[PDB]
Amino acid sequence: VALVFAAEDVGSNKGAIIGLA
Amino acid sequence: VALVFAAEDVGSNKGAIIGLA
Ligand SMILES: [Cl-]
Ligand SMILES: [Cl-]
Ligand code: NA
Q: Which positions in chain B touch A9 (Cβ < 8 Å)?
């Protein structure tokens, strides 16, 4: 967002997390 | 694995990661 936020990758799968800048 | 590794969720090209303890 620069900030690099970490968020849950909203999906049917295994506890994925993304780095949103 | 304790340690917490951020492995890669190869299930997308958006930078998702998986916590591997
Ligand atoms: Cl997920
Ligand atoms: Cl991804
Ligand atoms: Na992704």
A: 9, 12, 14, 16
Strand ranges inside B1-21, DSSP E: 5-8, 17-20
* Contact: A13, B11; criterion CB under 8 Å: yes
Resolution rounded to one decimal, in angstroms: 2.0
